[PDB]
UniProtKB/Swiss-Prot annotation:
Bridged cysteine pairs (disulfide): none
UniProt subunit comment: Component of the LUBAC complex (linear ubiquitin chain assembly complex) which consists of SHARPIN, RBCK1 and RNF31. LUBAC has a MW of approximately 600 kDa suggesting a heteromultimeric assembly of its subunits. Interacts with beta-I-type (PRKCB1) and zeta-type protein kinase C (PRKCZ). Interacts with UBE2L3. Interacts with PRKCH. Associates with the TNF-R1 signaling complex (TNF-RSC) in a stimulation-dependent manner. Interacts with EYA1, TAB2, TAB3, MAP3K7 TRAF6 and RIPK1. Interacts with IRF3.
Domain notes: The RanBP2-type zinc finger, also called Npl4 zinc finger (NZF), mediates binding to 'Met-1'-linked polyubiquitins.
PTM section of the record: Auto-ubiquitinated. Auto-ubiquitination leads to degradation by the proteasome.
Gene from which this protein is expressed: RBCK1
Induction: By viral transfection.
Similarity comment: family membership: Belongs to the RBR family.
Species the sequence originates in: Homo sapiens (Human)
Name this polypeptide is given: RanBP-type and C3HC4-type zinc finger-containing protein 1
Function, in words: E3 ubiquitin-protein ligase, which accepts ubiquitin from specific E2 ubiquitin-conjugating enzymes, such as UBE2L3/UBCM4, and then transfers it to substrates. Functions as an E3 ligase for oxidized IREB2 and both heme and oxygen are necessary for IREB2 ubiquitination. Promotes ubiquitination of TAB2 and IRF3 and their degradation by the proteasome. Component of the LUBAC complex which conjugates linear ('Met-1'-linked) polyubiquitin chains to substrates and plays a key role in NF-kappa-B activation and regulation of inflammation.
Length: 52
């Protein structure tokens, strides 16, 4: 495969290669379901704001 290809986050749509957030199991462009094969880093958050 590719040596050191971490790149940006999110799973690249297996159809439109649309780097979709690691929290969105679906696509936005071709709304093509997320490829189960892919792997998401458990214990992940949308990085929401805090401190009111
Ligand atoms: Zn897509």
């Amino acid at each position: 495969g590719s040596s050191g290809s971490s790149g940006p986050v999110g799973w690249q749509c297996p159809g439109c290669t649309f780097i979709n957030k690691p929290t969105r199991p679906g696509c936005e462009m071709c709304c093509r379901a997320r490829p189960e094969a892919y792997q998401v880093p458990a214990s992940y958050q949308p990085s929401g704001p805090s401190s009111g």
